[PDB]
């Protein structure tokens, strides 16, 4: 029901720890009540970027640990 308060993390680069012991990086552009994430693109953790912007599904997110403070 309530919105995930990620307005602190808006327009900052975040380590999206994602399903299956994987990772994603990138600057936060948006989100919704299901915790889907819209982010301006970055690499999959040696390293290799795919995409210009990226959208991560809600279910898939383990964590979204902030790279910037």
């Amino acid at each position: 029901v309530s919105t995930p308060e990620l307005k602190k993390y808006m327009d900052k680069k975040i380590l999206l720890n994602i399903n299956g012991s994987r990772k994603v990086a990138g600057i936060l552009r948006g989100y919704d009540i299901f915790l889907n994430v819209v982010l301006d693109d970055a690499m999959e953790i040696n390293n290799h970027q795919l995409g210009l912007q990226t959208v991560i599904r809600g279910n898939s997110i383990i964590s979204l640990e902030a790279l910037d403070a």
């Binding site: 029901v1 309530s2 995930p4 308060e5 990620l6 602190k8 993390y9 012991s21 915790l35 809600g58 279910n59 997110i61 383990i62 964590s63 979204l64 640990e65 902030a66 403070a69």
Partner: protein
């Protein structure tokens, strides 16, 4: 509404511990919690399932992937229940 949720909310401010499905325990000041246990935490250490530990700043965790949360024992006293 859920009393565990309420408890979690109350624990805001306090240093909660927090393990996930992965089995990666965290400890930190609980910044914010929601009805779905969508926890944020500050000044947080992060243990790997195998053993090794890593310091980190402001972790967010989605309650779906959370397993169990340890709250400080002062909250036992009052006045939610």
């Amino acid at each position: 509404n859920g009393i565990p949720v309420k408890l979690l909310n109350e624990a805001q401010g306090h240093i909660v511990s927090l393990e996930l499905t992965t089995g990666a325990t965290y400890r930190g000041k609980l910044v914010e919690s929601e009805d779905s246990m969508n926890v944020q935490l500050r000044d947080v250490i992060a243990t790997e399932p195998q053993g090794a530990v890593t310091h980190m700043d402001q972790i967010f965790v989605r309650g779906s992937q959370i397993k169990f949360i340890v709250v400080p024992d002062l909250l036992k006293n009052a006045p939610l229940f």
